[PDB]
Amino acid sequence: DDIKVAVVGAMSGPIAQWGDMEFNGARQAIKDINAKGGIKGDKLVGVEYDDACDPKQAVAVANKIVNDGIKYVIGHLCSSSTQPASDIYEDEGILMISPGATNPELTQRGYQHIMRTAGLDSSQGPTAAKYILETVKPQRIAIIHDKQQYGEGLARSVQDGLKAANANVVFFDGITAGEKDFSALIARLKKENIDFVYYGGYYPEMGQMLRQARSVGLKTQFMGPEGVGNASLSNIAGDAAEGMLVTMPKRYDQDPANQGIVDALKADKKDPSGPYVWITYAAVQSLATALERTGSDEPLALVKDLKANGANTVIGPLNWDEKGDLKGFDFGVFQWHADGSSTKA
Ligand SMILES: CC(C)C[C@H](N)C(=O)O
């Protein structure tokens, strides 16, 4: 019979563009797998849910998935929405592979039904700190975050990494997500002669912060995690996007092996350049590899099979550890430009 698979992420809310990549990658993977014969004759069917990357809505979607009879879940997208949903899935015995959540706490609580194809912030954070200490070498640093699990976790990780080398972190503060007016922050950066800022958060706040800093002549160097590295960033920031540092996953769309999938996305007039297009495609490929190899429909047996044998996907040969995290998922550093393009630094 038809194998149903929930795909869960942001189809609405302020970071819906990340979700656009997720659903584009999932749809294409489900379509390619069915085109080659499915899972031993059976058809994969994606069932799409919108949690809006919001903790409360995520708990509502997870509850609905249990009630709908679905046993496998590619989601959720954000860390703050994925973690509370995983509590429900673990209790009900449902497989959950997150293509987007990078916060470490997800897979550090003994949950047996939980995996991910996204990286870890326990590696993205230290990658930023290393680059700050060794290449940028600023005199005076401020670290800002958006008071949510992903951004605040990365901001705290960069604070610790810098403080390990006794770098001058002048101050550490948060701003509320959805902020329009950053004039108070900018005034503090001028007062404290801050020449470098790490922002933990997503692209809507990064964009407006960059534009407003340059409008009054701040010469500050900014940096953020992969959550700011979006096509929207330079549209919001304008010329202030130039020089922006950001940690991102490898450019999977420039891998020759993925050129067939790039061409399929370009035929549907879709942007193939986003990291989570590929990381989500990979999560469907891992679920399909486990169903095919074992011939089983038990969530626990599918996870054990993946931890043991791995899977060959569009983001490389995947090798999970006992907790459900990928081993050897590396972030690189990129200089952003005003036209939305970027180059490795
Ligand atoms: C899509 C990504 C920007 C999501 C981010 N890694 C998080 O855990 O919230």
Domain boundaries, given as residue ranges, for the chain: 1-120+250-330, 121-249+331-345
Resolution in A: 2.0
Count the neighbouring beta carbons within 10 Å of the beta carbon of residue 80.
Answer: 19
C-alpha pair distances (Å), 207 with each of 164, 229, 232: 29, 10, 8
Rounded CA gap, 335 and 229, in Å?
10
- Residue 205 CB neighbours (<10 A): 27
Q: At what angle do helices 299-309 and 275-294 cross, to 10 degrees?
A: 110
Q: Which of 52, 64, 109, 117 is nearest to 290 (CA)?
A: 117
- List the structure tokens of 179: 């902020």
Bridge-partner residues for 144, per DSSP?
Answer: 173, 199
Q: Which of 67, 60, 72, 57 is nearest to 26 (CA)?
A: 72
> Reduced to 3 states, what is the DSSP secondary structure of residue 4?
strand
Question: Does ligand 1 have an atom closer than 6 angstroms to the CB of 227?
Answer: yes
Joined tokens for residue 177: 């997500």
CA dihedral 334, 278, 237, 123 (to 10 degrees): -50
Where is the chain broken, named by the residue before each break, C–N > 2.5 Å? Answer: none
Find residue 50's DSSP bridge partners. Answer: 9
Asked if the domains at 1-120+250-330 and 121-249+331-345 fall in one CATH topology, the answer is yes
Residue nearest to atom 9 of ligand 1 (CA): 78
The rounded Å distance from CA 228 to ligand 1 centre is: 10
Is the Cβ atom of 101 under 6 angstroms away from ligand 1? yes
Pairing state of beta strands 245-249 and 114-116? unpaired
Which of 220, 218, 210 is CA-nearest to residue 141? 220
Q: How far is the CA of 216 from the centre of ligand 1 (A)?
A: 31
Nearest-CA neighbor of 42 among 303, 299, 291, 298?
Answer: 291
Atom of ligand 1 nearest to the CA of 227: 3
Ligand 1 atom with the smallest distance to the CA of 53 is: 9
What is residue 55's DSSP assignment?
Answer: H
CATH class of 121-249+331-345: alpha beta
> Which fold, 1-120+250-330?
Rossmann fold (3.40.50)
Give the CA dihedral 339, 242, 248, 255, nearest 10 degrees. 40
**Pick from 104, 107, 146: which is nearest to 125 by CA?**
104
Q: Is any atom of ligand 1 closer than 6 Å to the C-beta of 77?
A: yes
Q: Are 234 and 241 in contact (CB under 8 A)?
A: yes
The answer to whether the CB of 329 falls within 8 A of the CB of 242 is: no
Q: Using alpha carbons, select from 329, 345, 343, 286 the residue that is nearest to residue 121.
A: 329
Which residue among 11, 15, 74, 79 has the greatest number of ligand 1 atoms within 8 angstroms of its CB, and so is best to mutate? 79
From CA 184, how far away is CA 110, in angstroms rounded?
Answer: 42
Distance separating alpha carbons of residues 185 and 172, to the nearest angstrom: 11
- Dihedral, CA of residue 199, residue 203, residue 205 and residue 211, to nearest 10: 90
Distance from Cα 49 to the centre of ligand 1, integer Å = 17
Pocket test for ligand 1, best of 17, 150, 157, 206 (most atoms within 8 A of CB): 150
Distance 102 CA to ligand 1 centre (A): 6
Determine if ligand 1 sits within 6 Å of the CB of residue 102: yes
**Beta 331-336 vs 342-344: how paired, if at all?**
antiparallel
